[PDB]
Design a protein around this ligand. Sequence first.
Ligand SMILES: Cc1cc2nc3c(=O)[nH]c(=O)nc-3n(C[C@H](O)[C@H](O)[C@H](O)COP(=O)(O)OP(=O)(O)OC[C@H]3O[C@@H](n4cnc5c(N)ncnc54)[C@H](O)[C@@H]3O)c2cc1C
Ligand SMILES: Cc1cc2nc3c(=O)[nH]c(=O)nc-3n(C[C@H](O)[C@H](O)[C@H](O)COP(=O)(O)OP(=O)(O)OC[C@H]3O[C@@H](n4cnc5c(N)ncnc54)[C@H](O)[C@@H]3O)c2cc1C
Ligand code: SF4
Ligand code: SF4
Ligand code: SF4
Ligand code: SF4
Ligand code: SF4
Ligand code: SF4
Ligand code: SF4
Ligand code: SF4
Ligand code: SF4
Ligand code: SF4
Ligand code: SF4
Ligand code: FES
Lengths: 664, 137, 411, 549
Amino acid sequence: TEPRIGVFVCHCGTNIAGSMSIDDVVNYAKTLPYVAVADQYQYMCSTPGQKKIDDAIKEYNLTGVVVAACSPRLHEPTFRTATKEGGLNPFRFEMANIREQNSWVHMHGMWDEATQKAKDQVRMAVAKAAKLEDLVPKSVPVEKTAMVVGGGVAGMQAALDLASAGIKTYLIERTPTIGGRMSQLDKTFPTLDCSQCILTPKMVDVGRHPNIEMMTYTEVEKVEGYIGNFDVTLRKKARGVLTPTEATAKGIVGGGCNGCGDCSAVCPVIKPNPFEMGMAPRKAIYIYHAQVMPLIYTVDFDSCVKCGLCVEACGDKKAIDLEMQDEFITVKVGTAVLATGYELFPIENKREWGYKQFDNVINALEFERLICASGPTGGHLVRPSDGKTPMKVGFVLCAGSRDNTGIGKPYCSRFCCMYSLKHAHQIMEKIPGAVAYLFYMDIRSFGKMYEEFYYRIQHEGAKFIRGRVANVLEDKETKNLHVFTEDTLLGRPVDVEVDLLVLAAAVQPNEGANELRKKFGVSASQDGWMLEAHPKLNPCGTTTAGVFLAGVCQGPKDIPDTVAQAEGAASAASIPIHMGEVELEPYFAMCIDELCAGCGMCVNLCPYSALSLGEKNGRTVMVVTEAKCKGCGTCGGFCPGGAIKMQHFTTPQIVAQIDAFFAG
Amino acid sequence: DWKPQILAIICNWCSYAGADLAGGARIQYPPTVRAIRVMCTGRVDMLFILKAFVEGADGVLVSGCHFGDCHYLEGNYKAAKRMFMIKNLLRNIGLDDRRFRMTFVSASEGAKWGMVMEDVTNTIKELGPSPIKEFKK
Amino acid sequence: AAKGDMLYAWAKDAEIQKKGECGGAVTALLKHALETKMVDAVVAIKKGKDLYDAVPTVITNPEDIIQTAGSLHCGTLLIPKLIKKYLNGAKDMKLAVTCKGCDAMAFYELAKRNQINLDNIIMIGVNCGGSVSPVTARKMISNKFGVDPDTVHKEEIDKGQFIIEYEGGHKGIKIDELEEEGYGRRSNCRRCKMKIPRQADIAAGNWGVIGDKAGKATFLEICSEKGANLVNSAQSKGALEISPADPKGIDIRAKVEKAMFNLGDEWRHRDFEGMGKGKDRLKLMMSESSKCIKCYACVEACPICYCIECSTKKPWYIAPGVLPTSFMFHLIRFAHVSDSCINCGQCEELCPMEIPNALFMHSQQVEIEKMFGHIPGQDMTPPIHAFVEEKAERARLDATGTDSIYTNIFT
Amino acid sequence: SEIMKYVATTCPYCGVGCTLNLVVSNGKVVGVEPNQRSPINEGKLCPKGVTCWEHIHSPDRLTTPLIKKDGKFIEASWDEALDLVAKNLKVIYDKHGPKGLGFQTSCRTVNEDCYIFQKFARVGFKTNNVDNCARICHGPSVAGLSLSFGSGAATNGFEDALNADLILIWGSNAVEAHPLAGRRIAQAKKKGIQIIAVDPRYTMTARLADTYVRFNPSTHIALANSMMYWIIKEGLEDKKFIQDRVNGFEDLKKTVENYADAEAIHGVPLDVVKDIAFRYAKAKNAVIIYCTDNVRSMGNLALLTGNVGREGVGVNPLRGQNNVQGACDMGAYPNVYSGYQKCEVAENRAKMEKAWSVTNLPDWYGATLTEQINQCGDEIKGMYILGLNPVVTYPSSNHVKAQLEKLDFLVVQDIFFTETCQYADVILPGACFAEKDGTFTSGERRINRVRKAVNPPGQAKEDIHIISELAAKMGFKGFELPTAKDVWDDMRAVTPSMFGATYEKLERPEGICWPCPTEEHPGTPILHREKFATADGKGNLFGIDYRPP
Ligand SMILES: Cc1cc2nc3c(=O)[nH]c(=O)nc-3n(C[C@H](O)[C@H](O)[C@H](O)COP(=O)(O)OP(=O)(O)OC[C@H]3O[C@@H](n4cnc5c(N)ncnc54)[C@H](O)[C@@H]3O)c2cc1C
Ligand SMILES: Cc1cc2nc3c(=O)[nH]c(=O)nc-3n(C[C@H](O)[C@H](O)[C@H](O)COP(=O)(O)OP(=O)(O)OC[C@H]3O[C@@H](n4cnc5c(N)ncnc54)[C@H](O)[C@@H]3O)c2cc1C
Ligand code: SF4
Ligand code: SF4
Ligand code: SF4
Ligand code: SF4
Ligand code: SF4
Ligand code: SF4
Ligand code: SF4
Ligand code: SF4
Ligand code: SF4
Ligand code: SF4
Ligand code: SF4
Ligand code: FES
C-alpha cells in the first residue's frame, strides 16, 4: 500500500510512438497495483523531461519512479540524477527498455503485439520498483602508505614514482642491495650504455628519498587484510652490521659501517659470491659489489665461524653484532606492488648441452659477469678450462625455450635474442679477430631500434646459422666444444668448433615467488607467472584488490617495458591513496547472519575471495568483505537458505518481476 | 491463436548489450521473449527457473557470456553447472527438457540474438503449451 | 590390525559375546572406548518397549553399554541428524557412534556442510541388508507367519530370508516372496547399494564368517587409522579377541556383496521405470505432491537440509496459508537435495500424507550421479555446486559439440 | 543430567492420539522426534505435533499461586491460597446448598484429572454441576449417536477404514483437522477404495475423493433423506439386518417419502444423489466419516444399509479435542458418573455410595457450561475452573465477562495467565502435558499414555495433586492418591466398562480400546459386534424432518 510509483513513457520522437500505442501503455499503467501517476512525453532525456519527473515527484509524493524509455545502459545515470534531484534515492529508479528491445525490432506489421510487449515490460518494471530500497553510497578508507616488494629496476621505479607522488613507501628487498638483475649486466641492448652508470643515479635517488623506507635484506612473512588496509608482517633478517642510524638508536655515538672494508680484509672465510654467479670469492662479511646502494657489509651467519677478527677490524665503531637474530615488524600499508623479478631456468637438465659437465659451457648471466670490467677478471673473457682467451664463441639461442618436451619452457623469453646479439658484439669488439657464431631459430628483434641493432651485428661480422643445436661434444685434449646441428638454410649438417659456448637459457620466476604471490592471494598464470586482472586492458592489476604487478614477475620483458609497467603499477596503486577512499560497488552482497548456517560452501565460490567464514555472536557465520565484492551475484544465487542479500537484485525483487510477467 | 510465454534472464554485460546492438541495427524478430536483466547470469538461482516454469512459463531462456568472457570472470561457469542440473531435473520430472536453454551471446552478436529469438520461438511453438498449466498448479 | 586387514573379532567377556548379535565385538569396542576415555559418550540403539521399538541412547556410564548389545532390524532411524540437533554437532564432545551405511553417508554429507565435526566422532559402522518398519514387521508376522507378534523373541534377516525365533520354534520366509506382496524391507532399502560402509572407521558384519565361528565371531574390516588404533588398544587391554580371517571367508563375503548390488540394481530399475515417463510421470508427481500438508518433516529429517530457514517457508516462493501447496514446494527440494541424496528414506517414512519422497529424490539422484560422476556419501568432496572447476565445465560443454546448452546432452 | 533422553507421549492437540518422543536434555524438553513403534501414526506427525514442544518452557508460564487483594495480583504460598479456597468454598456451600457451586473442566486434561475433578465435585459437596467444553468445542454428536446406537463413541477405529470399499467423507475437514485420520483416507486411495466427499466446500480432503458432491450449507439432513429415500425405493436396504437388529423402520418410511426431489433444498442434482446413494448401498463394506439431528441422520443411513457391526464399517465422528472422549468417560459430564453410567438410575448411585464411602448422591440433572454461565449470578455463586478460558472461547465475550463479574470467588487454575484469570480471586498454576503422568482417550476410544518428561517450573503441581491437597484441607475423605496410577485404579474399581485396562496393559504401545471388561480382554476395537447397547439389543432409527435455518 505504501509504495507509490510514477510511470513515465517516452515517445523518443516517433522512434517509439511509431511502433506501439503510447496512449494504450499509459492507460494500462494507470491501473497497475502501485501507480500514482502515468504520464507521456516526447523527449524525456532532455531538460523538460527531468523537470516533469521532478514536478511529478513533488506533487504526487512518489515513493519511486519507473521510466519506459531506451536501455538503462544509455540513460540510467541521467535519470538517477534526475530522481536524486527531487528528494529520492538514486537507486529507487527503475527503467523499462521499450526502444532497443521492443520498438526497433518490432516495426513491420507488429502493432498490437508490440503494445502488448510494452505493457508486459512496464508491468515487470513497476513490479520490481515497488520493492526497491535505499542504497546509501559508502566507502572504505585507505591507509596512505604503499609497499613495494622487490628492489630491482621495476621495484625501484615504482618506489620512486610513489614517493615523488607524495606517498610514504616501503621498498622490501630480499638481498642486501637493491639493484637487481640490471646491476649484473655489463652493457644494455641496443644502445650499449653501461648498466651501472645509468642505474647508479636511480639507486642513490632511492637511497636519499625521504618518502622511501629502503628495507633491504628482509622479506614478507605474512599478509592479511584487503585493499583498504593490508596488515603485513615482515622479518628483518639478521644483518649482523648496524647502520649509523641503528647505531645511534642502539646507544653508541660511534657510527655504524661507513663502508671502509677492513672487516672483509681480515676475514679468514672464503665463499662464493651470488652476485658474480658463484665465480668469485667473498668473505663471510661482505658486499655484493662496490656499487651497492646500502654500503653496509652484511655478514653471512651460516658461514661465519665467529672468530671475532672483524670486530677488531671495526674498533671504535662497533658496527658488528655477531649474536643478533631476526626481528619481526608489523607494517600497515594501503596498497602493494609485487616486483619479484626472475631467475635462470636450470639448464643443467637438457643433457645434450653440457652446461655442468663441460667446463667451457656457460650461461648468459655468467657471460655478463665475465665480460664486465667489475667481474671476477678484468673484463677479459677467458676460458674457464685454462684461462686462455677464446677466439671462437658460439651462442645457443632458445636454450630451454619454445620447448614442449616438459623439460624446458614452452614460451619465448623475449630478450635472449637481443642480449645474445649484444654478447656477440662485445666479444667481436673486445677480442680482435674473434668470431661469434649464433645458432638461432627465429631471430626476434621486435622493439624500437632492435632491427637496426640486428643489422649492425650482422654488418660487424657475426655469423648466423639458422638451426637449433642438436648436441654438444667436447675434445678431451683441448677442452673445445663441437656443436652439432643443421644449417637449415643451405640445408646441410654442420659441426662448428668453438672455444666457448654460451647458452641463452630461459627465464623463470625467482625461487620463493610463488609462495609470496600465494601470500597476497594472487593467482599464477598457465606459464607460471603472476596472473593479471585483464590480459588486455589491465596489465598492471590483479583480481585481488589493492595488489599490482610490475616487471618480469608479470612476464619476461626488456628494461624499458619493465619501467613502463612499474610506472603504470605505481599510478594504479597511487590512485586510491590519492583519493583517500575506495567507493564500494552500489550493489554488494550482505550476509543476513540470522539466516546463515555456517556451511561455508559459498566461500570458494567467489572469484575475488570476498567471502570468508567468521565468528559472530558465538556462531560461525559468513563475513562479506565489501571492499572485494563486485555485485556479481554468484553467492546470492547459490545459497539455499537465502542468507545472502544481493541488494537492488534481491530474490524478492527478481521473483516479483517473474510474478508480474505471468500476471494479467 | 495460442501465444507462447517465453521468459529470458540475460546478463547485463554481454547478452543485454547484444540485444541492444540488435535493436540498434534494426534486426527484426518476433515479439515473444521478455527479459529480466540480472548482472551476471550467475545471479540466476535454480529457484528462479523453477518458479518460472511453475507459474506458467512455456519456455525459459538464459543468456550469458562466452566462457572466458564473463565480466566477473567466473559467473557463467556456475550458471552452466546450474543449468545442466536444471536440464536433468526437467527431464526427470517429466517435463520436456528442450523447453529450457542457455545461450552464450556476446556484446557484438546482434544477429545471433535475433537468430536465437527466432529459434526459441519456433521450438516453443512446436512443443506447445506447458503441461504444468493443465495439471492443477 | 592396521588399515585394511580383515579380522575375526569377539569379546573376552562371556556376557557381551552371548548378548552380542554376532560375537559382541562392536559392543566390546564401544565399552572399551568409553572405559579408556577416548570418547565422552557413546550414541547407540537400545530396545524400547519391545524388540520392534528401537530408541537412540547416549551412554556416558560404561556399565550401561551391555543393554545396547544386539542388532534391531526394525530400527529405521538415522543417527547423525540427531547428533547435529541435540549435541551441537559434537563440537565439544568426542563421540563413538555405531552406524549403518546410510548413517555413515549422512555423517559425511553433514560433515561436508560444517554441520558436525568428524574429527570428534568414531564410526563403528555395520553392514546392512535392510531394515523393516516396525508396524510393517508386525503386519508380516501376524499375516504371513501366522504368529502373534508379541510372542516373538527374535527377528532377523539371514541368507536372504526373514527368520523369527518365537516361543515354540522358528519360522523363515524368503525376503523376495514378502517383497512381492508388499512387505519386507523398506522401499529405499531394496534400492540401497551401501552394504559394507568402508567410509566408516571400522566395518563390522557377519558375512564371511565360516565354520566353527558361524555365529560366534564378527567380521571386522579396518577402514581407517583411527579404527586401527581403537582395535589395537582393545586387543592390548584384554577386552577383545582378534584372529586372521580365512581367505575363502572373504571370497564368500565379496560374492554376497555383489549379489546384494545386483538385487539393488534390479529394484532400482523396477521402481524407476514403474514411476513412468513423459507427461505421465509429471502427472504422477504433481498428483502425489498435491497432498502435502506442510508438516516439514521431510525437511527436518533429511541430513542434507541444514538451512536455518528453508526456502519453502519464504513467502515469495510459497504463498503462506494456502494448503493446496504449489508444485514449487517439492521442486525446491529437488533442486537442493537431488544432487547429493543418500537414499536414507526418512523423508518417505515420516510423511503423514504417504508421498513417495525418497523414490522421486533417488530417481533424480541416479541421473545426477551418472552425469556429473559425484557419489554423495564419502570422502567429503564438496557438493557439485559448492565447487565449480573451469576445465570441467569447458569439457562438459565441448562434449555436446554445440555452442549452447540445448541438446545432445543425454542418451 | 540426561544429555539426550527420549520420552514417549501422546500428542495433546487433537483426538487422533498420535505418539511422539519428547527429547529431554538437562531436564528441559528440547525437541520432538518420531516414534515409529506406534501403530496409530507410525512415527508421523502433523504440523502441530512436530511443534508441540515450543510452549512447554515459555517464560510466561505461571510459577506461583496468585491471590487478588484490593486489585493487582500478589504472589502467595500454596498453603495460603488453598486455605482461602477451602474457607470460601465451605462458606458458599453452607450458605447456598449444592446449587451454588459450579465446576468446569477442559477436555485437554488427562483422565485422572477429570475423574478426580468430578469425584471432588460430588464426593464432597453433593452436586453434579460439573461439565466440560465438549458441548461447545466438539458438539452434540455424542448425544445423537447415543440415541441411535446406544453409545455415542465412534464405532470403528481409523485404520479399519482400509478394509472398507466406499469410504464416505461427509462434510469434513479431515486432512485440515485430524490430518492423520486422513492419512488413512490417502492410504485407501492408494489401495483403490472408492471415496466420496460431501464437503459443502472443495477442500484438501475432497481432493483425495474419487467423486465430489457440493451441497448448500446446513442442509445435511435433507441430502441424507434423499439418499435414504432412493435406497428404500429400489430396495438396496439390508432386509435381513433390519429385521433382527433395527426398530422403527416403518416410521422412517413414512418420514422420508416427502423428499423425492429435494433440489433447491440442497443443490445436488437428482442423478448425483441417486449415483452416490446406490454406490453407498451397493458396497459390501462402507464407512462414514463425519465432521443432534445431523449425526442421528448419519446413524440412520448406516443402520438402513447394514454397515455397523463388522470390519471397515460404521460412523466415525472425529471428536476435535485431545481428551474429549476421556473427559466424558471419566464422568466430567452433568448426568453421568463414569463410563456413561446414567446417574438417573438409583443402582449406580448405590454402587457409588458403597465404593466412595459417601451418602445422598445428587440424582438431579446438572447444568452445562452455557447453563452455568447464564445463571452465574442469581443462584450459581462460586465456581471452580480447571483449564477453560471462557471469556475468549464463548460467543458474546461481553456477556461472559459480565456474568463472571457477577459471581463471587472464581478460581481459574491454569498453566497460562489468560484473560479469564484476572476475573478470578485465586489462581493456581497447573501443569502441561509434558509435566503430567496420566492418560488420554483418543477419538477411536484408544487409551494412550502420557508420561512425565520434565518437572513443573516452580511451585506448580499436577491437577490431581492440587485437588487432593484441597480435599485434605477441606477434610474430605477418599483422595489419598499419591500418584496417577492409584487414581486410575480407583476409577477402575467403580466403572465396569474400563475395569480390565490396567497400567500394565497400557504400557504396550498399542494401548487399549474402551469397552474392556475383564483383565484378559484384548480390548474392543469394533463396537456393537453382536448387539446394540440400547434398552434391548436393537438400535432404533428415527425420522428427521428438515427445519429450514
Ligand atoms: C643475461 C641477460 C641480459 C640482459 N640484457 C638486457 C639488456 O641489455 N637490456 C635490457 O633492457 N634488458 C636486458 N635484460 C633483461 C633485464 O634484466 C630485465 O628486463 C630486468 O632485469 C627486469 O627487471 P626486474 O626488476 O623486474 O627484475 P629483477 O632485477 O630480477 O627484480 C627482482 C628484484 O626483487 C628481489 N626479490 C625477488 N624475490 C623477492 C622476494 N620474495 N622478496 C623480496 N625481494 C625479492 C630480487 O632480489 C631483485 O632485487 C637481460 C637479461 C638477462 C638475463
Ligand atoms: C538393521 C540391521 C541390519 C543388518 N543386516 C545385516 C546383514 O544383512 N548382514 C550382516 O552381515 N550384518 C548385518 N547387520 C549387522 C550385524 O548385526 C552385525 O554382525 C553385528 O550387529 C555386529 O557384530 P556384533 O554382534 O559384535 O555387534 P553387537 O554387539 O550386536 O552390536 C550391535 C550394535 O549395533 C547397534 N544397532 C542396533 N540396531 C541398530 C540400528 N537399527 N541402527 C543402528 N545401529 C544399530 C547397537 O546399538 C550396537 O551398538 C545389520 C545390522 C542392522 C542394525
Ligand atoms: S530517454 Fe531514451 S527514448 Fe526517451 S527521448 Fe531520450 S534517448 Fe529517446
Ligand atoms: S669494518 Fe666496520 S665500518 Fe668497515 S666495512 Fe666492516 S662493518 Fe663497515
Ligand atoms: S667473526 Fe665471522 S665475519 Fe668476522 S672475521 Fe671471523 S669469520 Fe669473518
Ligand atoms: S628471445 Fe630469442 S632466443 Fe629467447 S626464447 Fe625467444 S626466440 Fe629464443
Ligand atoms: S551464506 Fe549461505 S552458503 Fe554461505 S555459509 Fe552461510 S548458509 Fe552457507
Ligand atoms: S557478489 Fe560475487 S564478488 Fe561479491 S561476494 Fe558474491 S560471489 Fe563474491
Ligand atoms: S538404506 Fe541401506 S544402509 Fe540404510 S538401513 Fe536401508 S539397506 Fe541399510
Ligand atoms: S513430510 Fe510429506 S506432507 Fe509433510 S511437507 Fe514433506 S512431503 Fe509434505
Ligand atoms: S531427500 Fe529423503 S531419501 Fe534423500 S537423503 Fe534426504 S531424507 Fe534421505
Ligand atoms: S530444502 Fe533446500 S532450502 Fe530447505 S532446508 Fe533443505 S537445502 Fe535448505
Ligand atoms: S494428528 Fe492430532 S495427535 Fe497427531 S500430531 Fe497432529 S494434532 Fe497431534
Ligand atoms: S557478466 Fe554476463 S556471464 Fe557474467
